[PDB]
Amino acid sequence: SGFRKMAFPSGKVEGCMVQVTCGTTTLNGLWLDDVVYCPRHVICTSEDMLNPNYEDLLIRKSNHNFLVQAGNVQLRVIGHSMQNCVLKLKVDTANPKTPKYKFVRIQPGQTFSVLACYNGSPSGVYQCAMRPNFTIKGSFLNGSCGSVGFNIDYDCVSFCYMHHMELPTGVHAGTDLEGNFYGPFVDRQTAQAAGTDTTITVNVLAWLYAAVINGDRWFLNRFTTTLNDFNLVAMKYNYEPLTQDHVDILGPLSAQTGIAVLDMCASLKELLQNGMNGRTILGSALLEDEFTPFDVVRQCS
Amino acid sequence: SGFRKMAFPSGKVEGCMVQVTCGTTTLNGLWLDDVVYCPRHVICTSEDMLNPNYEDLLIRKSNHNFLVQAGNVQLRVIGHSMQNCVLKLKVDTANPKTPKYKFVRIQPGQTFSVLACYNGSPSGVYQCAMRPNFTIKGSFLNGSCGSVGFNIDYDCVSFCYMHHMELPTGVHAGTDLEGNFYGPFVDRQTAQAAGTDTTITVNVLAWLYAAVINGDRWFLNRFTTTLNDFNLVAMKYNYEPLTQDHVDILGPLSAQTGIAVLDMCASLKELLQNGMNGRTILGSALLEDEFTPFDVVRQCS
Numbered sequence: 001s002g003f004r005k006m007a008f009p010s011g012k013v014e015g016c017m018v019q020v021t022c023g024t025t026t027l028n029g030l031w032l033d034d035v036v037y038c039p040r041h042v043i044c045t046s047e048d049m050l051n052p053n054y055e056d057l058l059i060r061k062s063n064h065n066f067l068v069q070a071g072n073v074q075l076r077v078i079g080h081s082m083q084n085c086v087l088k089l090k091v092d093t094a095n096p097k098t099p100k101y102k103f104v105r106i107q108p109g110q111t112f113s114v115l116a117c118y119n120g121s122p123s124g125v126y127q128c129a130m131r132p133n134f135t136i137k138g139s140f141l142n143g144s145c146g147s148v149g150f151n152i153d154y155d156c157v158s159f160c161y162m163h164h165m166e167l168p169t170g171v172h173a174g175t176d177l178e179g180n181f182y183g184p185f186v187d188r189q190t191a192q193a194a195g196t197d198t199t200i201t202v203n204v205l206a207w208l209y210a211a212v213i214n215g216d217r218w219f220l221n222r223f224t225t226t227l228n229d230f231n232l233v234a235m236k237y238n239y240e241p242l243t244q245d246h247v248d249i250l251g252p253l254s255a256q257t258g259i260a261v262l263d264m265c266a267s268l269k270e271l272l273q274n275g276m277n278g279r280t281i282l283g284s285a286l287l288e289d290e291f292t293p294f295d296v297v298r299q300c301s
Numbered sequence: 302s303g304f305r306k307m308a309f310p311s312g313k314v315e316g317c318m319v320q321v322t323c324g325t326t327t328l329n330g331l332w333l334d335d336v337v338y339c340p341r342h343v344i345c346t347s348e349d350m351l352n353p354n355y356e357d358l359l360i361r362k363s364n365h366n367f368l369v370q371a372g373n374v375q376l377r378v379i380g381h382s383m384q385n386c387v388l389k390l391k392v393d394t395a396n397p398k399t400p401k402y403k404f405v406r407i408q409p410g411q412t413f414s415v416l417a418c419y420n421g422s423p424s425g426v427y428q429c430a431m432r433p434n435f436t437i438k439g440s441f442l443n444g445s446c447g448s449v450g451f452n453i454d455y456d457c458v459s460f461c462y463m464h465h466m467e468l469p470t471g472v473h474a475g476t477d478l479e480g481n482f483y484g485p486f487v488d489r490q491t492a493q494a495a496g497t498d499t500t501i502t503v504n505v506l507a508w509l510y511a512a513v514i515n516g517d518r519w520f521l522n523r524f525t526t527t528l529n530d531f532n533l534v535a536m537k538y539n540y541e542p543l544t545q546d547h548v549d550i551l552g553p554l555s556a557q558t559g560i561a562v563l564d565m566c567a568s569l570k571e572l573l574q575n576g577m578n579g580r581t582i583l584g585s586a587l588l589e590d591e592f593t594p595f596d597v598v599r600q601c602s
C-alpha cells in the first residue's frame with residue numbers, strides 16, 4: 001500500500017554525469033560511450049546572450065577549450081560538433097559505466113525522473129511530468145544546466161530530457177537528447193514565457209484508480225457519464241479532452257478495480273463541480289495529474 | 302526555482318542491495334563489507350507468525366539454509382547471528398561497492414530517502430518522513446521487506462531505516478540498522494496499529510519559508526505572535542509544540558527571507574484558523590510537513 005511520487009533508481013545515470021567547462025561557464029554533461037552531450041549554451045558568454053550565432057561561436061572553439069572532468073579524471077576532448085541545441089564532445093575514453101540506453105522524445109502528459117546535478121555531481125532525484133505546454137515544474141538552481149531526465153525499462157535507460165533554462169514563472173524548459181527543444185522555447189535571451197497550460201485528464205483518472213486501489217473510495221458514485229458529456233465538463237475546467245485511446249489505456253486499472261472508466265469520469269465530474277468538501281485523496285487536497293496510468297500500475301498491486 | 306520532494310541519488314545504495322532467501326521466503330538484504338543485513342522475519346514460516354521464538358528458529362538454521370544473491374553472483378554465507386530484529390549474515394566476499402557509511406537512528410520529524418526494492422532489485426526511490434508516531438507513509442508492496450532508508454552527507458551514506466511491515470492503516474513500520482524498531486511495533490502478528498499522529502510544526506514553517514523563497518507570499522501578514530500564544534493554537538490543531546531550538550534552527554531561513562520566525566508563526570496561525578480560501582502554496586492545497594529546515598536549505602537558493 002501507499003502511493004508516492006517515485007523516481008527510478010538513479011545509479012545508472014549517476015555514472016554518466018560529468019562536468020564540462022568552457023571559458024568561465026561550467027555545467028553538466030552526459031557521458032555515454034566516447035561522447036559527452038551538453039547544452040550548447042556552454043560556449044556562450046553572458047555578453048553573447050541576446051542573439052548568439054552558435055555556428056560562429058563554435059567555429060572559434062578548439063578541442064582544448066573544453067575541460068571535461070569525470071569525477072577526478074580529466075577526459076581529453078578529441079572532437080566537437082553541434083546537434084541542434086546540444087554539443088557532442090568526442091572524448092578519448094569510452095565511459096565504462098555506459099548503460100544500455102536510448103534517446104526517446106516524450107509526449108506532454110508523460111512522466112520521467114530528473115537527476116538534478118551541479119558541477120557534474122548529482123544532487124537529488126525526483127519525478128516530473130512534461131506539461132501540455134511543454135514546460136516542466138522542476139527544481140533547479142544555477143548550475144543545473146545539462147541535468148537529465150530519463151525513464152528505465154528493464155535495464156535500458158531512455159533519456160528524454162536535458163535541462164536548459166528557467167522561464168519567468170519559475171518553470172523549466174529543455175531539449176530532448178537530440179537537442180530539439182520541447183515547446184516553443186529558444187536558447188537565447190527573449191521575453192519567452194510558458195503558454196497557457198491544462199490539466200492532464202487521463203492522469204487524474206489514473207490517480208483516482210490508484211486511490212481506489214489504496215482504499216480511498218469516498219468520491220465514487222453510482223452514476224456513469226458519456227465520453228461526450230464528460231469532455232464538455234473537461235473543457236469548462238481547463239482539462240484536456242479524454243479520448244477513446246485514453247479509455248483503452250485505463251482498461252487494466254478499470255478491470256482491477258471493477259470501476260468502468262466512464263463511471264470514474266462521473267466521479268471526476270462531481271469533484272470538478274463541487275470540490276472535495278474538505279476531504280483528501282491519497283494525501284492531497286487537489287486533483288493530481290502527474291501520475292500516468294503506467295506509473296500507477298508500476299506502484300499499485 | 303521550484304520545490305519538489307527530492308530524494309538523494311540512490312546509486313551508492315543500489316550497489317548494496319541483494320536478495321536473501323530462506324525456505325520459501327525471499328526478501329532484500331543490505332550488503333556492506335562482508336556482512337548482509339536483513340529482517341529476521343526471513344527465518345519465519347507463515348505458520349510461525351503468531352508468536353515466533355526467533356532465538357529457537359535461528360538455532361535450527363545453518364549457513365547453507367541462506368541463499369544470498371548479488372545480481373547473478375551467489376554469495377556464500379559463512380556465519381549468521383541475530384541483532385535485535387535484524388539478521389547479520391557473514392559472507393565470504395566483501396562488497397567491492399561498499400560506500401563510506403554509518404548506521405544512524407533518526408528522530409520523528411526527520412526525512413530520508415527510501416530505495417524500494419523487490420527480489421534484491423531496486424524499483425524506485427522517494428522521500429519519506431519519520432512521523433511523530435514512528436510510522437512512515439511509504440509505498441511498499443509484498444516483497445519489499447528489507448528495503449532501506451538513508452541520507453547522504455558528502456560521500457557517506459547514513460542508513461537509518463530497514464523496512465519490515467505494513468500496519469492496518471496502510472502506513473509502514475521498520476527498524477534502524479541495528480534492528481531496533483521505530484515505535485511500539487513488533488515483528489509478530491498482533492492487532493498493533495499506528496498511534497495517534499500530529500503535524501510536524503517546524504517542518505511546516507520550513508516549507509512556508511521555501512514558498513517565500515519561491516515567490517509564494519500571499520499568506521504573509523504584518524502580525525507577529527509569541528511562542529506561547531502560537532503553541533496554544535498549535536495544540537488546538539494537533540500540531541507539535543514549537544521550541545526555541547526549532548526557532549533557532551529556522552534562523553538561516555528567517556535571515557535569508559527577512560521574515561522573523563514568530564512572524565511566520567502568525568501566518569501559520571492564520572492559515573490554521575481560516576484555511577487557504579482556495580489558494581495553494583508550492584502547488585499544495587494543504588500544509589506540508591515532510592520537509593525539514595535542512596531539506597529546504599538544500600533545495601532553495
Ligand SMILES: [Br-]
Binds near residue numbers: 283284285585586587
Ligand atoms: Br494538496
